[PDB]
Amino acid sequence: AAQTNAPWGLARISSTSPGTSTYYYDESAGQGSCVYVIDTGIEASHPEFEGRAQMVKTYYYSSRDGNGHGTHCAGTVGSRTYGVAKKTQLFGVKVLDDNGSGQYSTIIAGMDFVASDKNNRNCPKGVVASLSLGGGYSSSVNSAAARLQSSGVMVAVAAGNNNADARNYSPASEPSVCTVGASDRYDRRSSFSNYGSVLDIFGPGTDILSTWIGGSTRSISGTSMATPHVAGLAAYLMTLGKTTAASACRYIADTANKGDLSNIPFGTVNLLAYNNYQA
Numbered sequence: 001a002a003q004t005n006a007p008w009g010l011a012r013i014s015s016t017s018p019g020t021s022t023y024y025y026d027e028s029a030g031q032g033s034c035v036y037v038i039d040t041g042i043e044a045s046h047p048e049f050e051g052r053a054q055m056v057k058t059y060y061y062s063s064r065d066g067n068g069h070g071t072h073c074a075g076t077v078g079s080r081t082y083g084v085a086k087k088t089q090l091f092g093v094k095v096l097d098d099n100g101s102g103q104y105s106t107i108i109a110g111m112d113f114v115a116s117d118k119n120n121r122n123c124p125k126g127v128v129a130s131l132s133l134g135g136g137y138s139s140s141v142n143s144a145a146a147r148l149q150s151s152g153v154m155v156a157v158a159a160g161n162n163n164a165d166a167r168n169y170s171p172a173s174e175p176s177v178c179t180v181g182a183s184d185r186y187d188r189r190s191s192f193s194n195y196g197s198v199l200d201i202f203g204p205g206t207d208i209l210s211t212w213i214g215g216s217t218r219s220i221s222g223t224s225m226a227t228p229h230v231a232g233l234a235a236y237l238m239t240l241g242k243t244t245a246a247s248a249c250r251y252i253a254d255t256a257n258k259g260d261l262s263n264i265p266f267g268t269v270n271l272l273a274y275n276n277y278q279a
């Protein structure tokens with residue numbers, strides 16, 4: 001399948017070179033996989049989700065996304081126009097309030113919840129968790145992310161947006177999950193993107209068009225936007241049978257575009273997510 005005039009990030013992950021505008025992808029499109037979007041919630045009623053999105057847990061008064069951030073991330077995972085894996089099932093876990101804030105205890109609870117809840121869901125091709133959030137180093141937060149990964153869920157987390165070494169941020173610094181940095185349309189590291197040896201992969205993170213609350217769309221930047229590209233790619237590759245939850249991060253790094261990025265400091269991988277599609 002080919003999506004013409006696609007958002008640049010989708011085009012980038014199906015091309016060996018920047019500047020293209022077509023997203024090439026296999027028609028299976030992540031069907032039969034499931035991605036938990038752990039964030040401010042999802043506007044499940046957005047037409048772009050076509051009924052494939054559902055809220056399953058909230059830690060606040062409402063399960064509604066009153067912010068937009070979680071809806072935007074879910075859209076890059078799996079909306080029809082803006083999504084990597086256009087047929088995957090989306091589950092929303094609201095651990096962040098509508099201001100975008102949330103305590104570590106609630107984020108840990110949300111991670112423990114997914115590890116259990118997935119056993120209740122029909123996801124024959126595998127389960128992914130997308131965490132476009134973080135804060136300062138916490139061993140408890142890292143441990144919760146490691147537990148979620150250990151339970152059989154591919155965990156993708158944002159590296160952070162401080163132009164600093166991600167080793168001082170959580171869950172970014174957990175070695176066993178898949179830590180995602182941000183790139184822009186010119187194949188530079190985004191100026192805000194954290195870096196360091198704990199990074200596993202880069203994805204498109206600057207000026208990312210996706211869904212927003214009120215049935216709208218908008219373009220925003222962050223390693224929060226790169227992470228759902230990698231989460232959706234994992235779901236897509238798991239449906240194709242190319243990898244499992246335990247090894248999808250490694251497989252994505254093995255098959256990435258290598259050496260293409262600029263502004264990569266010594267010690268950081270130069271790898272850009274790539275779906276390797278061949279018509």
Ligand SMILES: O=C(O)[C@H](O)c1cccc(Cl)c1
Pocket residue numbers: 132133134135136158159160161162169170171172223224
């Ligand atoms: O840069 C920040 O906003 C925070 O430090 C941070 C850390 C880790 C992940 C995210 Cl999305 C944000």
